[PDB]
Amino acid sequence: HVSAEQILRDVYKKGQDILDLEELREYQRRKRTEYEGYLKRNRLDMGQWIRYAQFEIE
RNA sequence: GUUCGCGAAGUAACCCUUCGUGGACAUUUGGUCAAUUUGAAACAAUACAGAGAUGAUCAGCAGUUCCCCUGCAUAAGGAUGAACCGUUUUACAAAGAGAUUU
């Protein structure tokens, strides 16, 4: 009962707040540095532009 | 200051000197810049780790960059020079069926 589906199923099974305004400013700094880093290296993933703009809508 | 012209004194002196006068020669530099912190160099000092493929040990060459450094450099080197991996929802429909409000 050592069939390959059991091994691959178990290797799938093995693989698994804001308070103040300046804290939200640091949150926006961290998140905009993240998304401008992943838009500076790749300017052609349009989903990334979409979700960073939708972040700044949020 | 030098020279040219004139006058006045020494001085009833064409020698010389002094004083006064008009002219000419000569005509607008340097600073983007102030002498220790407070208009910005970076390394080094501490401490810890100690390299990209994966089971280990590695040669690399590349690409993107709103990262540069050493290099005379368009060569070459810098860990393959470094960051790359991270999140991840709508150009969004059409057909068919039943359960609901009127």
Q: What's the rounded Cα separation, in Å, for the pair A53 and A24?
A: 17
For this entry, resolution in Å reads 3.7
Q: At what angle do helices A21-40 and A46-57 cross, to 10 degrees?
A: 170
Instruction: Note the maximum CA span of chain A.
Output: 58
| Distance from residue A22's CA to nucleotide B90's C1', rounded to whole Å | 33
As to burial, measured by CB atoms within 10 angstroms (0-12 exposed, 13-18 middle, 19+ buried), residue A22 is: exposed
* CA A7-A8-A13 angle, 5° bins: 95
- What experiment produced this structure? cryo-EM
Other beta carbons within 10 angstroms of residue A56's beta carbon come to 11
DSSP assignment string, A39-58 = HHS-S--HHHHHHHHHHHH-
Helix (H) or strand (E) holding A11: helix A4-14
Helix (H, G, I), strand (E, B) or coil at A38: helix
Footprint of strand B on the protein (CB under 7 A): A 34-43, 45, 47-48, 50-51, 54
